[model samples]
Target: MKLDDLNLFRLVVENGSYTSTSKKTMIPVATITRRIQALEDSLNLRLLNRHARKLTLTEAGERFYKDCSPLLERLASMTEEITDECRGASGRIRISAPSNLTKRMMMPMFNAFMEKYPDIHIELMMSNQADDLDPTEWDVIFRVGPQRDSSLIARKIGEVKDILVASPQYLSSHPQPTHAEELHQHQLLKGYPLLKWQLTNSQGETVVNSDRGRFQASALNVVRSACSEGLGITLMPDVMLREFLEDGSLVQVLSDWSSNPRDIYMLYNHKDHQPEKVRLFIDFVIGYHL
Candidate 1:
């Protein structure tokens, strides 16, 4: 039996229909059926019951599928590994991410990845808006919170915690709020669309309306900058606040309370095959730590 025929049989069994296998592999349905028929004829065994709406494997077919699936997978993976090494995984990977997150969080990972695979080029598309365009435009897109696109595959990489913070200069000059309610007395800094801060701890959740802050900006980076310059307290992601918090530019306020963590997702198009560079990048991002 030809390896091609075996692989096709595996695909047909897994996909459950010749039409689906055809659509996925871009091979004609008739060709797929003929090949499977040829394999059955050669083996003198009826592998599948084709009369059913969804193909059902016969007893012999079931045993054949179970036995050959692992071998096919192992062979394919080995071939892929050797091919990747021979080709050196060279390709362009288009990645979309929010500006702030890209700068503060993902840049290091990107830099490191490119350094590791010098032949692989990256097109970094920075945008704060999520799901605003066709997902297929880029190889991967980084998004915060929930994903609405059903056509794309989303992998949860990590989460960003929104915490209340202010510069030590500001904290020293103003009364430090111990409780969530005391935040009302201090000047609040607000980012657009983040008008309300919902903080929760063991005591339950408290929603603080930050709409009346003396300082407001359309971007969280601006809000964070204002907080660092001692303008007012603002809720910012922990990922963005890390360096500032470490260097004493910002300090967490209401340590016991924090807004809900927004989940970070790496989105890619759902396809049967992806470029090696894109696959490597996705794996790297998923395994990356803050």
Candidate 2:
């Protein structure tokens, strides 16, 4: 009746047992048997000899399988092409991401995507102003941290884990940041738009605060660099500052606590249909291991 039904029928006939088909497809044996029965009833032909434990196709079924299997295979091959044509995937894909995320992290992925989809053009924008984003202006929007816009759909694929660190000199004689509130007394390296830090304790309690540090930057790396120089304590992604932590240039505190993971989300406006390029890029980025 449908492509799936035809495919199931072919699999059943080839395997010579519905049980085998069910095992291979992860479908319940009873469900497979029922569907095959329904299919047979619709055709008014006994497709399989159900008497034997080892199922066998009827003569009529054998001919049908031989004829229809090739047709189904051809249809399957054509399906992707039809879908690509329908989606008009050759056009430009407009994208927006935070400037800090784009500078180093996403460049390689952008290049890889461009190489993979030569037919498609990419128009990318980088910014940190969440409210300034026009959903209609970009086909895909890459967001780091909390998603403020509840109106759009966000597909999360990964998380950015941040480590709170300070120079050894800065940590010396200063109160260590064991609790979220304790950070207020220290000279904090704030991130822009209040540079609010959200941290999770061992008990899974979240604490949020915005510091009035003398130093503040929109970019995380700058904050990290300042922290390395003993300017103040700041949160940083461990991956970028692994060398600093290893060389003892910076030391991490609050071993029991960790900054709340900033989820990486690919956002898209609600639509009846998503473009093929958008879907492809989404799959490609999600598949890419960071």
Candidate 3:
């Protein structure tokens, strides 16, 4: 009675056996047998003459197959054509990323990507916490570290190293800490979740409790700004501090020690068929450099 059952009937006739049809289509032979039985029951016609090894289509079944096979083929082709039209490189891609990285690191790359694909549009969602956003709603999601969700396909785009930095004015007033352990002797500005600075060098690891500092902020931008104003030393991703370092607003401290590099990943749902624009943008982000 259903179009899919009719198509399965055609496949059974073409292959001459339910087992053969199952082998060709990966459908269970039991399911195919049930469907054919259901179809025969609905139509009130025996559709196949089964033998030990082969199957012969009944006269009514032959007529049904001949009448419906062409229609099924046309339907398949029409769906394919529709998908092809929609898959063209002209659609909006919704991207989710952390606010700090989006503003400090990836804005120019997004601009260039837009320039390269003039037909494609982007809808950006900025947030600091990935746990708050729904993964299914985004075409792509960028994260700072490894993700725990196995349902998504994660591709490492790059890695970021957190470096310690302080303004020149602060260093002029306070002695610069040459050793990792010496960081405790000076004021340490802290960011959220980075209350303890786990600095590692060729020698070993040193943990500095930055929460003991006079200033602490939930956002890295605030810590960066405080460091720029010569408030105290802070740890931040090198990419976010590149311009400041180049402009002499901030200088690297304890250069021999740094936090372990954390990988940056581009995540998307594990889809069987990805839109062309989304695929292109994924590749563009993976290859993009700032």
* Number of the predicted model whose lDDT against the real structure is largest: 3
Worst 10 residues of 1 by lDDT: 79-88
Kindly list the per-residue Cα lDDT of model 1 for residues 168-227, writing each as its tens digit. Answer: 999889978988888788899988546688877777867566557888766788889888
Alpha-carbon TM-score of each model against the true structure: 0.65, 0.59, 0.66
Better of 1 and 2 by TM-score: 1
Stretches > 4 Å off in candidate 2? 1-89, 145-152, 172-181, 203-209, 269-272
Candidate 2: Cα lDDT at 121: 86
For residues 1-290, write the lDDT of model 2, one tens digit per residue: 55577678898887678876774566899998888878888888888787758777899888889999998878877975474353455767778887666756777888998898899888886777556565765778988866666668887866667878899988876868778778788888866533777778889878776766768887777888888778878877766577898998899887667776667788886544577777787778878866
Regions of model 3 farther than 4 Å from truth: 1-87, 130-132, 210-212
Error of 2 at 83 (Å): 18
Tens digits of per-residue lDDT for model 3, 192-253: 64667888887776665545676887778888999999988998888889899999889998
Candidate 3 lDDT score at position 211: 58
Put the candidates in lDDT order, highest first. Answer: 3, 1, 2
Which clashing pairs does model 3 show? none
